[PDB]
C-alpha cells in the first residue's frame, strides 16, 4: 500500500524497476518526464520517488526542485550514471536521501527503498 514513483526517460528502466517493487507489494507509479512526474506527485502524493537525473526536457534537478515545492517532505532517491558529480551534489543539497549509480544492483536498490520507507 506504500506509493513509489519511478521517473526515468528510459522506458526499459521504468518497466524494470516497476516489476521490482511489485514483488515487494508496493503501489508503483511511473512517469517518463518532468511534467508527468509533477502531476503524479500532486495527485497520488507518493511516499518514495526514484528520480533519473538525465531526462530530456526537464532534468532531475529541475523536477526535484519542483517536487519539493509541492511536498517539502518528498522522499527522493536519485539514480544516474557515475560522473554526474554536479547533479549528484546539487540533489544532495536540495534534500535527496541518497543516490544510485547505474547500473545498480537490483538488490540494494530494493533495500534502500525498504530502508528509507517506514511501514
Amino acid at each position: 500500500n506504500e506509493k513509489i514513483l519511478i521517473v526515468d526517460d528510459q522506458s526499459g528502466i521504468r518497466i524494470l524497476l516497476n516489476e521490482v517493487f511489485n514483488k515487494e507489494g508496493y503501489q508503483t507509479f511511473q512517469a517518463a518526464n518532468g511534467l508527468q512526474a509533477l502531476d503524479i506527485v500532486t495527485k497520488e502524493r507518493p511516499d518514495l520517488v526514484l528520480l533519473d537525473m538525465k531526462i530530456p526536457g526537464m532534468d532531475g534537478i529541475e523536477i526535484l526542485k519542483r517536487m519539493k515545492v509541492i511536498d517539502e517532505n518528498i522522499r527522493v532517491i536519485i539514480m544516474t550514471a557515475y560522473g554526474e558529480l554536479d547533479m549528484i551534489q546539487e540533489s544532495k543539497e536540495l534534500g535527496a536521501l541518497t543516490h544510485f549509480a547505474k547500473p545498480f544492483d537490483i538488490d540494494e536498490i530494493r533495500d534502500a527503498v525498504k530502508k528509507y520507507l517506514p511501514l
Partner: protein
C-alpha cells in the same frame, strides 16, 4: 602532433554522453538478467545491435554534418526523442549533406515549438536510399502530443526551398512527413 584544445574538449564531452547511455543499456541488461528474464535480455541486446547498425550506416553516407546532428541529437536539449534508420544500401549522399542537415535542423526546431511538454514525444526518421524514382527520401514519423500544431502550418503551405514535401499529415497525436530529394 596535437589536436586543438577546443575539439579535444568536445570529444570528451561527447564520449561522456555515449558512456552515460551505455551505462543505462547495461542497467537494462543487468536488471533483466537478475529478474531472470533471459529471453528479454537477448531481445534488448539485439535492439542495441540494430540501433548501432543504423548508427554506422548513417556514418557511412558521406554526410557528416547530418550524421553528427542525428548522432548527438538526444544529448542536446529537446522535447522529443529522436530515433533514425537508414533503409537501403549505403550511398555517397555527400551532395546532400549540407541540404539535409539544414532541413532537419529546421524541422527539429519546429517540432520543438510544436510538441507539448507533458507528453512523451518520439520522432523516428528514416532515410531511404533504395527508392527507384527519387535519389533519396526522408520519412519523419512523429508520435506524441502537440501544444501548437500551428507551428507547421507555414512550412505546410509554402513548402521549403528546393525540397519536395510529398506528404505532411498531422493528426491529434501523430505526424507523418515525407520528403523527396533527387
Amino acid at each position: 602532433n596535437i589536436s586543438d584544445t577546443a575539439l579535444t574538449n568536445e570529444l570528451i564531452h561527447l564520449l561522456g554522453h555515449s558512456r552515460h547511455d551505455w551505462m543505462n543499456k547495461l542497467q537494462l541488461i543487468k536488471g533483466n538478467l537478475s529478474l531472470q528474464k533471459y529471453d528479454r535480455v537477448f531481445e534488448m541486446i539485439e535492439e542495441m545491435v540494430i540501433d548501432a547498425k543504423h548508427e554506422s550506416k548513417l556514418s557511412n553516407l558521406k554526410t557528416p554534418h547530418l550524421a553528427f546532428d542525428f548522432l548527438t541529437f538526444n544529448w542536446k536539449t529537446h522535447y522529443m526523442t529522436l530515433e533514425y534508420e537508414v533503409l537501403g544500401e549505403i550511398k555517397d549522399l555527400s551532395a546532400y549533406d549540407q541540404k539535409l542537415a539544414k532541413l532537419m535542423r529546421k524541422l527539429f526546431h519546429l517540432f520543438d515549438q510544436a510538441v507539448s511538454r507533458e507528453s512523451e514525444n518520439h520522432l523516428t526518421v528514416s532515410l531511404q536510399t533504395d527508392h527507384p524514382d527519387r535519389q533519396l527520401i526522408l520519412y519523419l514519423d512523429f508520435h506524441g502530443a502537440f501544444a501548437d500544431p500551428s507551428a507547421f502550418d507555414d512550412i505546410r503551405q509554402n513548402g521549403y526551398e528546393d525540397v519536395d514535401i510529398m506528404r505532411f499529415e498531422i493528426t491529434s497525436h501523430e505526424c507523418l512527413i515525407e520528403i523527396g530529394l533527387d
